[PDB]
Swiss-Prot record:
It is found in: Secreted. Toxin which activates the particulate form of guanylate cyclase and increases cyclic GMP levels within the host intestinal epithelial cells. This is Heat-stable enterotoxin ST-IA/ST-P. The lineage of its organism: Bacteria, Pseudomonadati, Pseudomonadota, Gammaproteobacteria, Enterobacterales. It comes from Escherichia coli. The chain holds residues 60 to 71 of 72 of the full protein. Belongs to the heat-stable enterotoxin family. Disulfide bonds join 1-9, 4-12.
Length: 12
């Protein structure tokens, strides 16, 4: 998620 690898991460 710190890389926004998954767009459903918070803030992505």
């Amino acid at each position: 998620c710190e890389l926004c690898c998954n767009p459903l991460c918070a803030g992505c």
